[PDB]
RNA sequence: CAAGGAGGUAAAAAUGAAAU
RNA sequence: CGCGGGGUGGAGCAGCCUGGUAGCUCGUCGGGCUCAUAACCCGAAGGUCGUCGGUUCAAAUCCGGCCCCCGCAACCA
RNA sequence: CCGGGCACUCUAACGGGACUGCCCGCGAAAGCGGGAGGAAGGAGGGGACGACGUCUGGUCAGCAUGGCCCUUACGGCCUGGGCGACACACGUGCUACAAUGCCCACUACAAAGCGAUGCCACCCGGCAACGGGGAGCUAAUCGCAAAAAGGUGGGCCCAGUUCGGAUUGGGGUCUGCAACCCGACCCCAUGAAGCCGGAAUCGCUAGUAAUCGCGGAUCAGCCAUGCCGCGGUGAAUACG
């Protein structure tokens, strides 16, 4: 097969960065891996949400992070928990501007990351895959959707033989660069092993 | 399968003569890139003409090109695992090529020691029909001849 | 009897008893192969109807491949009682 | 050894020559760019989710 | 003229027909007719007879030059004999002093291929 | 002589300078 | 200007491979 | 046991007679061709001449003594 | 170099710019040939982009991970050794066998990039590697660098030779806790094989092949002749 990551092949035109910072040497890589914690510290007790993406801006001791969930359900205003010390244990090893705020992604089903992981979460309920392929494929479809690819690799169902189930309706061009096509993945853990969920979500541009 | 039948490569003429030919030579003269010093060599021998004899190198450079071009050469065809060996004519291109190509292989096939008075002499002795190239012309030559037989395989 | 071997592996189990070259399951089967590969005399003796023994062709031709299990082989070249060059390769 | 090498890496004492380079996201010793403290591989992953600030595909 | 051990090179000029000493290849050559003061782009051809001699006397004598310096370097060989250290074994197998790589190459001091065949 | 440490041109392909090849003027 | 039927037909070039 | 012929590289054969050179095919070893083998092509290595004596400046060669191999002979009673 | 100016060159940001649109011919169309049109053309030249799938291809030694196995140990620390071993065989290469060549001196003309826990001008010692100093540079400012092939001059004169540089002795320098096994240079002396390659076998159709040097990553240093880039000069030939 072999094929570029549809996000790597636009980032210029179409589909901006995710961490948007300029630094010289003797500073990038040590606000690199940083950032890189605050995602990894960020996706674990923040996966209940589903969270789309995770922007990052910084200027000087500044770092703003700007953290997409279809429901922020775990946000509960204000003094009712959930953002308190949970935005402030991020200066454990930072100490700088956590300035963390909370966007609502409003079609989950147009969101690639949030189709992949809810794939992988049924993969993990042990569901039929193929029809839960065949679902969400539709599911985003059913929402407005101009082309829409869901691809589910390896050990499907367990039994020993490493499959691939393959579903996509309408247009999804990935060879074209005026595309906006957002690219979502999972992994799903499972008792017989690990299997990935690609998810390709298309939109028109021009 | 040579959809394109590749047009003719056209060259820059050189200084002071104006040739669609000399340049041609000088290229084969030429080796790793250095026109320079193969322009050199050419121009450098047609000094060396000047003085073993009272003629203009335009024409003896000219003529040595003129006697040392093939009529007609030997050409292995078809049938037989690629048996025969028709002698086929030779197209103007390619006696140009032949020409200029033997003439530098014969003159750095001599003995002397520098690179110009090989060229001149070569050119001479090829303006006479004495030069080596000449030979070679004339070997090529003797082949085609003696191939008359299945000449009428032709194509 | 062996002398010589091509795998690390079937080496270390063989010589100083150490089966973290091969699969875990496979440490009894490839012992009680490796030591009828050691006692034999002649190829013959190495034609019990669980090894599948039989010469290898073309490139391989010389050499021989009991079968330890599933797709697995020791192949070795034997002559004048000894083995050879005792590998545990895939048939592939 | 894997876990306690990775150790090593940061730990950097005694002698100046012993300390190495090793990618932070995976622990690979080799390929290491110091610009980055990443391996080629992980690198490559990072550039094309979009988490490197300003690196893009090079076309020329 | 027989300078030190050798006579031989005739018209070619003295700081190429120095070089034919073992002792003197060319950095000493030049150093040799600066110092003692002789044109390095004469004939060899037997010139001026004085100067043949200044150089003779100085460079024969000064430092060590032919049969003699090649004793020198086979006794520092014959150093790491006794008892010697690595280099000396090196000196012995006929393999490359310096640590270099045997596995292909080394042609210099093993000699032609033999080829083994197995 | 691209590989003798004795030549302008030596010490050009090796990169090194010296006596043979010094550092301008 | 559009072929139906009749005839001279390549050479030198052999083998299989190691669970379904 | 009576005559004749023969023992030479791993195999089969020359060279002996007209003493000073041991050569041929196959095989082996290296390298090529092919996905691979065979075939093919390139390049190599390899012989105490059965053995024990003698002649001679010099022995595969000429002369003896044994040691095997093959072939003829063994008739008249 | 200043005053001053920024039209040229350059820098980098958006644009214009050919779509065979226009002419002749062919054709039912698509299209094809040809011609002024211009820097450019009938996808201008190169990039990034790799369909359904194939190879039980590759990768448990980047990483994640199902199963199996090891736990006073198949884990952990350390000094030392080894990965660099060499009777041989193959792959990809570097340097050559020379005179369109070698050596020395002088003198030009690039691009793309890297550097203030470094690049290091200019002086000083030193044959040199290099060491002492020490200015400028958070760098279209200072530095790495003079690009090299080229040119001009002069010397060798075709001989294993001023070709070729291996191998070896000695003397040094620099990094590094330390360079025996196993580091790169510098200097003295040695100067080998090779005089152009058997059967076979590779690359490239235009800035291309060939040839020349320059940068970078990794990097204390370096076994880099490697890899990824940059420009300099610049062929031959395509009937089929
Ligand atoms: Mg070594
Ligand atoms: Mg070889
Ligand atoms: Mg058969
Ligand atoms: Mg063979
Ligand atoms: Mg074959
Ligand atoms: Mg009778
Ligand atoms: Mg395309
Ligand atoms: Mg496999
Ligand atoms: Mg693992
Ligand atoms: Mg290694
Ligand atoms: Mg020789
Ligand atoms: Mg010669
Ligand atoms: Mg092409
Ligand atoms: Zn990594």
């Known amino acids: 097969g072999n094929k570029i990551h549809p996000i790597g092949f636009r980032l210029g035109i179409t589909r901006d960065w995710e961490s948007r910072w300029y630094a010289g040497k003797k500073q990038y890589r040590h606000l690199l891996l940083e950032d890189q914690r605050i995602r990894g510290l960020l996706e674990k007790e923040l996966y209940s949400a589903g969270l789309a993406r995770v922007d990052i801006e910084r200027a000087a001791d500044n770092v703003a992070v700007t953290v997409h969930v279809a429901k922020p359900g775990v946000v509960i205003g204000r003094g009712g928990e959930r953002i308190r010390v949970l935005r402030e244990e991020l200066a454990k090893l930072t100490g700088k501007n956590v300035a963390l705020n909370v966007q609502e992604v409003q079609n989950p089903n147009l969101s690639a990351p949030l189709v992949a992981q809810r794939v992988a979460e049924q993969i993990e309920r042990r569901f039929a895959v193929r029809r839960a392929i065949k679902q969400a494929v539709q599911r985003v479809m059913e929402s407005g959707a101009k082309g829409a690819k869901v691809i589910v690799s390896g050990r499907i169902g367990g039994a020993e033989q490493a499959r691939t189930e393959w579903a996509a309706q309408g247009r999804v061009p990935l060879h074209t660069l005026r595309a906006n096509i957002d690219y979502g993945f999972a992994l799903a853990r499972t008792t017989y092993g690990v299997l990935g969920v690609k998810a390709y979500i298309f939109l028109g541009e021009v | ?155 | 009897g062996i002398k010589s071997f091509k795998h690390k592996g079937l080496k270390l189990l063989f010589e100083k008893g150490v089966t973290s070259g091969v699969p875990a399951q496979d440490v009894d089967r490839i012992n009680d192969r490796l030591q009828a590969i050691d006692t034999a005399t002649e190829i013959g003796e190495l034609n019990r109807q669980i090894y599948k023994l039989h010469p290898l062709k073309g490139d391989r031709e010389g050499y021989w491949s009991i079968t330890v299990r599933a797709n697995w082989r020791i192949t070795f070249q034997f002559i004048n009682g000894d083995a050879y060059i005792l590998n545990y390769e895939d048939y592939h | 050894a894997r876990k306690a090498l990775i150790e090593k890496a940061k730990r950097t004492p005694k002698f100046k020559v012993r300390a190495y380079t090793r990618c932070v996201r995976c622990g690979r010793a080799r390929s290491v760019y110091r610009f980055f403290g990443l391996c080629r591989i992980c690198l490559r992953e990072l550039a094309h989710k979009g988490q490197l600030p300003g690196v893009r595909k090079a076309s020329w | 003229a027989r300078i030190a051990g050798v006579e031989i090179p005739r018209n070619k000029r003295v700081d190429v027909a120095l070089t034919y000493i073992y002792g003197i290849g060319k950095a000493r050559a030049k150093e040799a007719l600066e110092k003692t003061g002789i044109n390095p782009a004469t004939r060899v051809k037997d010139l001026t007879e004085a100067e043949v001699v200044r150089l003779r006397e100085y460079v024969e004598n000064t430092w060590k030059l032919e049969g003699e310096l090649r004793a020198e370097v086979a006794a520092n060989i014959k150093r790491l004999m006794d008892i010697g250290c690595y280099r000396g074994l090196r000196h012995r197998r006929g393999l490359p002093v310096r640590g270099q790589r045997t596995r292909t190459n080394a042609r210099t001091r093993k000699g032609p291929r033999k080829t083994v065949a197995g | 002589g691209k590989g003798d440490r004795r030549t302008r041109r030596g010490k050009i392909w090796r990169g090194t300078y010296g006596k043979y090849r010094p550092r301008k003027k």
């Open chain 2, 1 to 155: 399968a040579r959809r394109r039948r590749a047009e003719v490569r056209q060259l820059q003429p050189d200084l002071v003569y104006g040739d669609v030919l000399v340049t041609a030579f000088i290229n084969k003269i030429m080796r790793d890139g250095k026109k320079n010093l193969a322009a050199r060599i050419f121009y450098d021998a047609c000094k060396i003409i000047q003085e073993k004899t009272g003629q203009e190198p335009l024409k003896v450079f000219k003529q040595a090109v003129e006697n040392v071009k093939p009529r007609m050469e030997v050409r292995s065809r078809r049938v037989g695992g690629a048996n025969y060996q028709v002698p086929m004519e030779v197209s103007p291109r390619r006696q140009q090529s032949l020409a200029l190509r033997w003439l530098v292989q014969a003159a750095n096939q001599r003995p002397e020691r520098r690179a110009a008075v090989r060229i001149a002499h070569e050119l001479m002795d090829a303006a006479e029909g004495k030069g080596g190239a000449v030979k070679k012309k004339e070997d090529v030559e003797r082949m085609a001849e003696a191939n008359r037989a299945y000449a009428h395989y032709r194509w």
